[PDB]
Amino acid sequence: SEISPEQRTAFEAAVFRRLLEHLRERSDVQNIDLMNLAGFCRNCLSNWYREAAEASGVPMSKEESREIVYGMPYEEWRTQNGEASPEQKAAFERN
Amino acid sequence: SEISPEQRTAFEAAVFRRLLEHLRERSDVQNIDLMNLAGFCRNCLSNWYREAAEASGVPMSKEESREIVYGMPYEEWRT
Amino acid sequence: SEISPEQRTAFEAAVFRRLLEHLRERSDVQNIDLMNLAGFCRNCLSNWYREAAEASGVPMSKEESREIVYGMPYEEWRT
Amino acid sequence: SEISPEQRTAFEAAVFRRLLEHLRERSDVQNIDLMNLAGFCRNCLSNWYREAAEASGVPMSKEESREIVYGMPYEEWRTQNGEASPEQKAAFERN
Numbered sequence: 441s442e443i444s445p446e447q448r449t450a451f452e453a454a455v456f457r458r459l460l461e462h463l464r465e466r467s468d469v470q471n472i473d474l475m476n477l478a479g480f481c482r483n484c485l486s487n488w489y490r491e492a493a494e495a496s497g498v499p500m501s502k503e504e505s506r507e508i509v510y511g512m513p514y515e516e517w518r519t520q521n522g523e524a525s526p527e528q529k530a531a532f533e534r535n
Numbered sequence: 536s537e538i539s540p541e542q543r544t545a546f547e548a549a550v551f552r553r554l555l556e557h558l559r560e561r562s563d564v565q566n567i568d569l570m571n572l573a574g575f576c577r578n579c580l581s582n583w584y585r586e587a588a589e590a591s592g593v594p595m596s597k598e599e600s601r602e603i604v605y606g607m608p609y610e611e612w613r614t
Numbered sequence: 615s616e617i618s619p620e621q622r623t624a625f626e627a628a629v630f631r632r633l634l635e636h637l638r639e640r641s642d643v644q645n646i647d648l649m650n651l652a653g654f655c656r657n658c659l660s661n662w663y664r665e666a667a668e669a670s671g672v673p674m675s676k677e678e679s680r681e682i683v684y685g686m687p688y689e690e691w692r693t
Numbered sequence: 694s695e696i697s698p699e700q701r702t703a704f705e706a707a708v709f710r711r712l713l714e715h716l717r718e719r720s721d722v723q724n725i726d727l728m729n730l731a732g733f734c735r736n737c738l739s740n741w742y743r744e745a746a747e748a749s750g751v752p753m754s755k756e757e758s759r760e761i762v763y764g765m766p767y768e769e770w771r772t773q774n775g776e777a778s779p780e781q782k783a784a785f786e787r788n
């Protein structure tokens with residue numbers, strides 16, 4: 441019921457980590473499609489996180505913030521691109 | 536690294552609040568299309584937030600979580 | 615095993631149609647609660663069906679897929 | 694647009710395989726909770742699949758149909774039960 445500002449922040453951070461989980465398992469969900477649809481993507485998330493750290497006095501590169509959001513160097517992730525969609529796996533890769 | 540657990544929490548929470556704000560301004564983006572593309576929507580966000588509070592020992596209703604994500608009662612947003 | 619690819623297709627399709635039928639009769643179960651519990655709902659089913667048709671070379675609209683899953687126009691079900 | 698009965702069946706089977714994927718990745722989603730909520734679970738799916746095979750003249754045990762739905766012997770799956778929820782992983786297993 442009655443929650444502290446430290447609880448609100450803990451719940452925001454944790455829900456953010458749930459989102460990150462989720463975008464990592466929906467590796468098929470393209471950033472451009474996210475961009476086109478929703479005006480953000482995993483890159484906007486990395487940038488906003490960078491902005492937050494820089495405002496807190498923590499210097500951080502584009503690629504450091506991306507490793508945080510992606511869970512691996514962004515290069516390791518986007519070269520793990522080339523792969524069938526969930527609906528194409530289901531259609532052709534099973535029976 | 537040199538970034539403590541509590542710095543991460545700060546940055547993760549700020550980024551979440553910025554997402555929330557950005558979804559409030561992109562009110563033209565339908566939960567349905569977010570769901571069909573990405574497998575989550577504003578209702579999933581409210582659900583994950585509620586589940587986070589529960590996981591931390593704080594019970595919370597479906598409507599409380601939605602108030603938080605939407606920045607208003609859900610039914611007022613539904614308009 | 616002794617069960618061919620085409621037997622599987624038969625059985626998988628029949629089980630899907632039985633699920634569909636069972637969700638039509640459990641119209642008291644809200645898409646929202648299905649979504650918050652299981653991470654899918656009747657709208658995800660319609661979306662997956664549309665994506666299956668697309669994956670097979672057949673374009674299909676959001677409303678066509680929903681007609682199939684709901685057994686009626688979505689808006690008529692929304693009532 | 695205009696689709697054959699063989700296409701309808703192919704799309705039903707494939708959407709069923711997408712569901713099965715999904716329930717396998719949401720291994721945290723309990724059958725009882727599914728039962729309580731929705732009047733079905735992964736066991737009802739196994740049973741219906743069994744009924745369909747038996748009607749097609751294919752004998753199949755309770756446990757064979759379950760291996761089909763679960764993707765592994767049901768024993769290997771339910772002993773891989775005891776594990777933190779997604780929200781508890783996010784809360785306590787990260788920073």
Ligand SMILES: [Mg+2]
Pocket residue numbers: 471475479480481482483484485
């Ligand atoms: Mg972006």
Ligand SMILES: [Mg+2]
Pocket residue numbers: 570574575576577578579649
């Ligand atoms: Mg959702």
Ligand SMILES: [Mg+2]
Pocket residue numbers: 570649653654655656657658
């Ligand atoms: Mg859904």
Ligand SMILES: [Mg+2]
Pocket residue numbers: 724728732733734735736737738
């Ligand atoms: Mg059941």
